[PDB]
Design a protein around this ligand. Structure first.
Ligand code: CYN
Length: 152
């Protein structure tokens, strides 16, 4: 678990994200796709994007950034009580989208980078540690669902 103070740090920086969810989503996906190009292959509708300029110009990529961070926001706000969300998210990422756990690690690292870049005053080491723990909790719970399904 995270402590109450850790949860408060996590949702404090998340409130900052929510002021421009779309901008944040776009930056997170760009950081992910450029840092780990294998991740881009999982998105049929983003495969044609070959440069960071092309990604930055893609309204659909920005829209999708909004979708993914909005979903994550709802999960974070459950402060670990996220079974209703995590169960179908696991099944879809394992079965429908075929997403290795390692890629969830990659996007978590991308989120940390972006939040630190944009909100350093609300994302010092302790708050970063808290966010990292929150994302690890989520990944760890999904991993259990992956194991249940026999997805590697
Ligand atoms: C999901 N992105």
């Amino acid at each position: 678990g995270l402590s109450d103070g850790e949860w408060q740090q996590v949702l404090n920086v998340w409130g900052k994200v929510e002021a421009d969810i779309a901008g944040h989503g776009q930056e997170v996906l760009i950081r992910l796709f450029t840092g780990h190009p294998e991740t881009l292959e999982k998105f049929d509708k983003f495969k044609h994007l070959k440069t960071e300029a092309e990604m930055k110009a893609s309204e659909d990529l920005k829209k999708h950034g909004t979708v993914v961070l909005t979903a994550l926001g709802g999960i974070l706000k459950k402060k670990g009580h996220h079974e209703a969300e995590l169960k179908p998210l696991a099944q879809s990422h394992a079965t429908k989208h075929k997403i290795p756990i390692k890629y969830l690690e990659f996007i978590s690292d991308a989120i940390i980078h972006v939040l630190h870049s944009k909100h350093p005053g609300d994302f010092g080491a302790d708050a970063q540690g808290a966010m990292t723990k929150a994302l690890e909790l989520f990944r760890n719970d999904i991993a259990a669902k992956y194991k249940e399904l026999g997805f590697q």
